[PDB]
Amino acid sequence: TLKSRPENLSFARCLNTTEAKFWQTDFLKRHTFKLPLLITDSQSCTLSTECDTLRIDFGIKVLPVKESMYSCSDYNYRTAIYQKIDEYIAEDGFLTLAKRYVNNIANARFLWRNRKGAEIIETIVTIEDKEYPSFNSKSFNLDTFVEDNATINEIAQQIADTFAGKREYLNIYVTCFVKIGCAMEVYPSQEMTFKGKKLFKFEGSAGMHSQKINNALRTIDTWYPDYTTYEFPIPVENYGAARSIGIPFRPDTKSFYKLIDRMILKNEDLPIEDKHYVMAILIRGGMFSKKQ
Amino acid sequence: MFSQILIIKPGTGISPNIIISEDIFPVLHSLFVEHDKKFGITFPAYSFDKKGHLGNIIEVLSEDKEALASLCLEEHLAEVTDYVKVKKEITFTDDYVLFKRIREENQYETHIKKKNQQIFCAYIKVKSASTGQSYNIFLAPTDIKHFSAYGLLRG
Numbered sequence: 001t002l003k004s005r006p007e008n009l010s011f012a013r014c015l016n017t018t019e020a021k022f023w024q025t026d027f028l029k030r031h032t033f034k035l036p037l038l039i040t041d042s043q044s045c046t047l048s049t050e051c052d053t054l055r056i057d058f059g060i061k062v063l064p065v066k067e068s069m070y071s072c073s074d075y076n077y078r079t080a081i082y083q084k085i086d087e088y089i090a091e092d093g094f095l096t097l098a099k100r101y102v103n104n105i106a107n108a109r110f111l112w113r114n115r116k117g118a119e120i121i122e123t124i125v126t127i128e129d130k131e132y133p134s135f136n137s138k139s140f141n142l143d144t145f146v147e148d149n150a151t152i153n154e155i156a157q158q159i160a161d162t163f164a165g166k167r168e169y170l171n172i173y174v175t176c177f178v179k180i181g182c183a184m185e186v187y188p189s190q191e192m193t194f195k196g197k198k199l200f201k202f203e204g205s206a207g208m209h210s211q212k213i214n215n216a217l218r219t220i221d222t223w224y225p226d227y228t229t230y231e232f233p234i235p236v237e238n239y240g241a242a243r244s245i246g247i248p249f250r251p252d253t254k255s256f257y258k259l260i261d262r263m264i265l266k267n268e269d270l271p272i273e274d275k276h277y278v279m280a281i282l283i284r285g286g287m288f289s290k291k292q
Numbered sequence: 293m294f295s296q297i298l299i300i301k302p303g304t305g306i307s308p309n310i311i312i313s314e315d316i317f318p319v320l321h322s323l324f325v326e327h328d329k330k331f332g333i334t335f336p337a338y339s340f341d342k343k344g345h346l347g348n349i350i351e352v353l354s355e356d357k358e359a360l361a362s363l364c365l366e367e368h369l370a371e372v373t374d375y376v377k378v379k380k381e382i383t384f385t386d387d388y389v390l391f392k393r394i395r396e397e398n399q400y401e402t403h404i405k406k407k408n409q410q411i412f413c414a415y416i417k418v419k420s421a422s423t424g425q426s427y428n429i430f431l432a433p434t435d436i437k438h439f440s441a442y443g444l445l446r447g
Binding site: 116 | 301304375
């Protein structure tokens with residue numbers, strides 16, 4: 001019935017992330033006190049003498065997955081996509097993937113370089129008007145995935161229910177407290193120059209791009225071919241690639257293009273791990289077209 | 293000449309070069325000095341010259357068993373347990389290859405260009421306590437079999 005992908009196919013995001021803003025703080029008086037942190041002209045940024053704590057504030061928007069297709073030039077492929085998505089929501093209610101996304105918040109991976117050399121890291125998660133119990137951050141490894149933590153389960157249930165379709169939106173706000181010490185460097189994100197390291201300013205203060213945080217949350221792929229050799233999560237990409245060490249971990253029949261033109265064009269039932277990876281690519285988004 | 297292998301986990305966000313520089317090499321300096329007994333450092337999978345990819349593996353060269361147990365690796369490079377691994381066996385490896393320190397000349401203001409980009413293809417950075425001036429130390433791999441404070445063979 002179906003021979004190829006249409007000439008115009010696109011998916012939107014389902015995980016929208018705001019940009020981050022930096023503050024200075026003291027630890028023992030953290031919940032009554034806040035000061036701006038500015039970039040000091042290369043360019044560099046360093047905490048003041050009177051403060052010893054960095055504060056990161058950002059938020060996330062969660063949208064349903066069915067209502068995330070922007071264009072499709074053939075109605076039959078759209079019906080096939082909706083049928084496969086309802087078959088996924090029959091088995092697993094987007095719950096393993098959501099648990100991995102809350103795990104990346106708990107692990108505090110978003111602090112990229114700012115995680116090494118800290119002494120106390122705490123993270124509090126706010127949804128609606130309820131603040132959930134905090135996290136320790138230095139009790140979670142960056143290579144495992146906890147599945148028995150109650151607060152992580154309570155957040156992941158709501159995130160999974162919102163992606164399923166039983167809820168239409170969810171707004172998640174996260175605050176982080178990192179104690180590095182007085183007069184230490186904070187390392188913010190760097191801009192693109194089309195010489196000199198020019199740093200990024202948001203509303204006068206300093207912060208990270210939303211892309212860098214979204215890259216942190218998508219490191220949830222542990223279903224690649226050569227997993228047993230190198231046992232480290234890789235961020236989710238089409239021709240699965242890690243800029244860390246120079247190796248295409250998916251060049252061929254395990255890539256997204258073949259795995260999606262082996263599920264919808266040739267109705268074969270795939271393993272659950274490949275279905276996890278295909279749905280994760282659809283919670284990421286992109287242009288997926290085919291000439292002719 | 294037995295051994296202990298410490299590993300630099302990949303991924304993790306931060307580059308392995310920085311992890312090698314900051315954490316590892318100070319503790320090593322200290323370890324080596326008090327002990328003084330000239331040891332050595334095994335940087336396996338030390339790839340190519342065009343490269344300089346020191347790799348994700350660190351091994352310590354020792355003579356006696358109490359020789360390497362001499363240093364309490366574990367418990368030292370410990371707090372940082374998510375970016376460096378400490379294996380738990382002392383293996384009597386014999387296919388080891390030793391590592392040497394080239395140098396590369398100072399600057400014109402301090403033929404300069406000829407020596408430049410000939411050794412500039414490892415560059416580990418160390419901050420000095422007394423002179424307070426950070427600098428680069430370059431490495432090599434060699435046949436010498438049977439060192440200095442930095443773990444590299446003495447000049």
